[PDB]
Design a protein around this ligand. Structure first.
Ligand code: ZN
Ligand code: ZN
Lengths: 147, 391, 168, 122, 237
């Protein structure tokens, strides 16, 4: 660590999570595909408060829902917005992404492709869980702190 | 007065052990193996392929140890003499041929394992042995060839007819393999290996499952094999693999399998599919479908059955392998331990002496069938076996 | 010393208590793994440390007890053959056996030997040799130690074969 | 938990299809012309952190297994103390050492995971 | 392969192996080891269908999940509901002599599989059977003082023999495979339900499930190590 902050358990952890490679796979609990036709209402009840909140200051009827894990989410210094905006800056306009705010009890990410409206998604899931990098450097997996 | 139903103590164990060693000695491994060969295995090798396109072989006899003399009568041979005179402690190998016109006999020599049922010393008393100039402490689980005592070291090898799933190297396109080396006890040991491979690693576009059939220059998607077996409906096929209707995880792994064999929807289309991957471009469908039927009935899982009406037996066993494969692939089980001694086998005198005798009986068989094809109007090379073994 | 032996046996019993507490902790799922480390890895890491720590401290007790007259201790003081690990294993506890850096593995299904019950992660189960050479190993400690030992004979053959080539 | 259905006629696997007018999920066959509505909108599930498989082996004879260890804890149901226990039946490096018990009286499975989170363990 | 595998116990000497290149690959059978000479499986198969084994041809998984799978020499011959009685009968038939002692029968209670092996090349050893046919108390070894008396009474007259023990179901042969499904007591005294500060320490018996007992632990050695005095006091190598 830098000459000054070399005796900070925290300045290390920060640098740790910043070097340790992290993919969505290490944060995701489970990914599911649903047939949710109305982009407004949702067959999924728990996902109403998330779409209701997306009308304040094209899309396929198929849904890709990801249920993240708070334990890893905060253990690897990751924000829903960060994760989301990364996925978003990965699939371009090609994908419609929305996620639940850090405050909600459940961290959910729902995506829609934007007729083969099925296979693409099952591939998109794969690419997300493994190919997208949320934080860290490529090739660096384990990263341990010592004194 | 020492109730005979009283418990036992540690010291009482040596009594039991002495009993063991009194009955088996220290080389029962040598004797019992070789003895099974002479008593059963042998006669069972003469009956297999005992008919030539007639001449049929029957019963077998085993002489006591004798010697091939030069300028003299045949002599009874004893160990102490075979070692000294550099002779071979072997015995006669007669048969019982039946020459039937269809458009005792001495054959070969078998070296005898000291103290086996067929050996003189086996019955010799402590006194008889002394007279024969043979130490009564000699254990005797070996042979005497050209004067020198030869021991056959136990050969360790993997067991056969055992399913085994193994993971693989990251670079390879296949992540898991379910293997089994089928073989037959009698007749011969056609070790045709069947492999059920799971293409794709954790996280690839549709992981498919294909099997490796002998003589087929391409891996065939499993669904097609099940249909060449007469199990057509996806429902039925998946039922032969997954034995739990609620196991949505395993069934999910088979989804890409179903799509992989979607083109074929009947036993014929299945057989022809397989037939082509093992035939030239000019062969007729009928011949192709036939070729595939024979491959699945003779070169596909032969340890189970090789007769005709047993397609359900092989279908369930194939499904069982798929089941084991995915089980490992789903991380519910670890890849089999290739070092477990339970799945190991040690081949001794008998088994070892059997592979040779078989190989030689077939060579002697060829030397007799030739004495018929070339015949227009006893002509048996006994040495074909004698020096074949001895060698 | 008879009293030293009572101090040694207790030192070992003390270690078996620590391992027993970590096991309960792990079986309750109260134990937490360090970053980039498996739950089972942290567990093993702790049991082996407890056990080696035990052997080592039990060894010192044996050495401290030996007098300046003790010939073994004498050869060590002069620097002519022998060392601590030697006294420690001969007189007190032999230690934890290992193969490929871990305790003896479940070669049978979920057990090290058919003489144990499934899922036994205790020190006796996975190769800790409580006994010394003076006391004599139990048949299980014997076989475990022979598995550890074998690895040495093999590695030595390799170390011998590989270094010879490098040297050239 | 995507229990999929097969054809009523040929028993072949059914595939999802969209009713572009009434916006609903259907499942047709690719062999015949069979078709039907969907029970749930769930068409796919992928569990990265799986639990299923940890119970595999619990049978009506699990008690007659001499290799298993026995504890005398108390089962939440019959309170009897005839227990048999084993660790997770899964085989993942990232597995815990939580113990699973099986009451030999009513065959009820109870865990020692103080962070218990499952209702059926199935 | 060169590693001394856990399954080698009682079958191959843990000490005697050639140094160098053949280290681990060349082995030596322990004193009481034996190898299967091979037996015909026809009768067993017959008895199986005679005792409720459902043919694979007439098997339907979604109709009987709890069903146990029955294998013979690697061949899946069928299925059987309630394998407990079959396994009981099978063990009785072998401890009687009806089934060749050389045959290995393994029931995988948890895996729902029952496997039998009659082939040759399997290395096995004899163990002390441990059941509770005796009412007087807990589980005990089938052999007793009366049995050993006859044994020696025969050893003195130089008829009760080793095979006698087998025929009377007092001792069994066990290969590595069947070894997986049992629990063996080390000393015969480990059945009995302020120690000498000189003896070696041992772990207390936490099982009343013993199925077998070692005749004697020193039989895990082969002819060579069998000659070393106090091997249990030597460094392994
Ligand atoms: Zn249909
Ligand atoms: Zn209960």
């Amino acid at each position: 660590l830098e000459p000054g902050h070399a005796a900070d358990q925290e300045q290390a952890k920060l640098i740790r999570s910043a070097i340790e490679h992290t993919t969505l796979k290490s944060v995701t609990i489970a990914s599911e595909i649903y047939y949710d036709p109305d982009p407004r209402s949702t067959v999924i009840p728990e996902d109403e408060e998330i779409i209701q909140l997306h009308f304040s200051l094209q899309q396929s009827p198929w849904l890709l829902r990801l249920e993240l894990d708070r334990a890893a989410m905060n253990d690897k210094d990751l924000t829903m917005g960060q994760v989301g905006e990364r996925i978003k800056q990965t699939f371009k306009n090609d994908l419609f992404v929305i996620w639940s705010e850090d405050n909600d009890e459940k961290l959910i990410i729902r995506c829609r492709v934007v007729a083969e409206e099925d296979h693409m998604l099952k591939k998109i899931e794969n690419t997300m869980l493994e190919n997208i990098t949320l934080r860290g450097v490529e090739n660096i997996e384990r990263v341990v702190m010592m004194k | 007065f020492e109730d005979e139903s009283a418990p036992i103590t540690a010291e009482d164990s040596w009594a039991v052990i002495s009993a063991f060693f009194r009955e088996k000695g220290l080389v029962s491994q040598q004797l019992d193996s070789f003895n099974q060969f002479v008593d059963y295995t042998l006669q069972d090798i003469i009956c297999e392929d005992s008919t030539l396109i007639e001449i049929s072989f029957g019963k077998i006899y085993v002489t006591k140890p004798m010697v091939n003399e030069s300028d003299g009568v045949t002599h009874a041979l004893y160990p102490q003499e075979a070692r000294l005179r550099n002779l071979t402690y072997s015995s006669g190998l007669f048969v019982d041929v039946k020459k039937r016109t269809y458009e005792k006999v001495f054959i070969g020599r078998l070296p005898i394992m000291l103290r086996s049922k067929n050996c003189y010393l086996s019955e010799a008393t402590e006194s008889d042995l002394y007279k024969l100039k043979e130490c009564p402490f000699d254990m005797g689980g070996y042979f005497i060839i050209n004067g020198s005592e030869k021991v056959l070291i136990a050969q360790e090898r993997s067991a056969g007819n055992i399913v085994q799933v193994f993971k693989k190297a990251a670079p390879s396109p296949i992540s898991h393999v379910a293997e089994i080396r089928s073989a037959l006890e009698k007749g011969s040991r056609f070790i045709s290996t069947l492999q059920v491979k799971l293409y794709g690693r954790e996280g690839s576009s549709a992981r498919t499952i294909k099997a490796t059939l002998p003589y087929i220059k391409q891996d065939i998607p499993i669904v097609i094999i099940f249909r060449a077996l007469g199990i057509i409906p996806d429902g039925e096929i998946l039922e032969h693999i997954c034995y739990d209707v609620n196991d949505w995880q395993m069934l999910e792994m088979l989804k890409p399998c179903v799509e992989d064999g979607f083109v074929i929807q009947d036993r014929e289309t299945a057989l022809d599919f397989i037939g082509r991957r093992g035939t030239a471009l000019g062969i007729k469908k009928e011949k192709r479908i036939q070729y595939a039927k024979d491959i699945l009935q003779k070169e596909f899982l032969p340890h189970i059955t090789q007769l005709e009406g047993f397609e359900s037996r092989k279908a369930f066993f194939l499904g069982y392998m798929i089941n084991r494969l995915l089980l490992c692939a789903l991380d519910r089980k670890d890849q089999d331990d290739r070092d477990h001694f339970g799945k190991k086998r040690l081949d001794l005198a008998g088994p070892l002496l059997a592979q040779l005798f078989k190989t030689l009986f077939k060579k002697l068989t060829k030397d007799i069938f030739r004495y018929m094809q070339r015949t227009v109007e006893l002509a048996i090379n006994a040495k074909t076996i004698t020096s074949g073994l001895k060698y | 010393d008879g009293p030293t032996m009572r101090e040694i046996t207790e030192t070992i019993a003390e270690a078996k208590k620590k391992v027993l507490d970590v096991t309960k902790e792990a079986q309750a799922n109260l134990l937490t793994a360090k970053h980039g480390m498996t739950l089972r890895e942290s567990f093993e890491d702790n049991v082996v440390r407890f056990l080696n720590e035990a052997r080592d401290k039990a060894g010192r007790l044996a050495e401290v007890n030996l007098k300046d007259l003790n010939n073994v201790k004498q050869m060590v003081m002069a620097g002519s053959k022998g060392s601590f690990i030697n006294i420690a294993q001969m007189s007190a506890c032999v230690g934890q056996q290992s193969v490929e850096g871990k305790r003896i593995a479940f070669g049978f299904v979920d057990r090290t030997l058919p003489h144990f019950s499934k899922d036994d992660y205790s020190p006796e189960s996975k190769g800790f040799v409580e006994n010394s050479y003076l006391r004599g190993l139990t048949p299980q400690e014997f076989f475990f130690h022979a598995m550890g030992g074998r690895e040495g004979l093999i590695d030595t053959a390799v170390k011998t074969a590989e270094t010879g080539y490098i040297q050239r | 938990m995507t229990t999929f259905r097969f054809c009523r006629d040929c028993n072949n696997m059914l595939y999802p299809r969209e009713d572009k007018e009434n916006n609903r999920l259907l499942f047709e066959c690719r062999t015949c012309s069979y078709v039907e509505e969907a029970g749930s909108p769930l068409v796919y599930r992928h569990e990265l952190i799986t639990n299923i498989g940890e119970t595999a082996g619990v049978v009506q004879d699990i008690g007659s297994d001499p290799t298993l260890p026995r504890s005398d804890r108390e089962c939440p149901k019959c309170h009897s103390r005839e227990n048999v226990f084993f660790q997770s039946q899964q085989r993942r490096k990232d597995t815990s050492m939580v113990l699973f018990f099986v009451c030999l009286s009513c065959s009820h499975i109870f865990t020692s995971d103080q962070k218990n989170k499952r209702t059926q363990f199935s | 392969p060169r590693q001394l595998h856990n399954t080698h116990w009682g079958l191959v000497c843990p000490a005697e192996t050639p140094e160098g290149q053949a280290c681990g690959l060349v082995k030596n059978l322990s004193l009481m080891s034996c190898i299967s000479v091979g037996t015909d499986p026809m009768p067993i198969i017959t008895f199986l269908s005679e005792w409720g084994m459902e043919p694979l041809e007439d098997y339907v998984p979604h109709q009987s999940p709890d069903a146990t799978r029955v294998f013979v020499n690697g061949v899946w011959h069928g299925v059987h509901r309630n394998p407990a009685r079959l396994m009981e009968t099978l063990r009785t038939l072998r401890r009687k002599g009806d089934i060749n002692p050389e045959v290995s029968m393994i029931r995988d209670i948890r895996e729902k599989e029952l496997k039998i092996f009659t082939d040759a090349g399997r290395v096995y050893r004899p163990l002390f059977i441990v059941e509770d046919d005796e009412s007087l108390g807990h589980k005990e070894l089938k052999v007793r003082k009366g049995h050993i008396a006859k044994l020696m009474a025969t050893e003195y007259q130089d008829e009760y023999t080793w095979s006698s023990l087998l025929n009377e179901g007092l001792v069994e042969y066990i290969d590595a495979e069947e070894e997986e499904s049992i629990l063996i007591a080390m000393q015969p005294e480990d059945l009995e339900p302020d120690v000498d500060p000189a003896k070696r320490i041992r772990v207390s018996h936490h099982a009343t499930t013993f199925t077998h007992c070692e005749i004697h632990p020193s039989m895990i050695l082969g002819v060579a190590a069998s000659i070393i005095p106090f091997p249990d006091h030597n460094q392994s190598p």
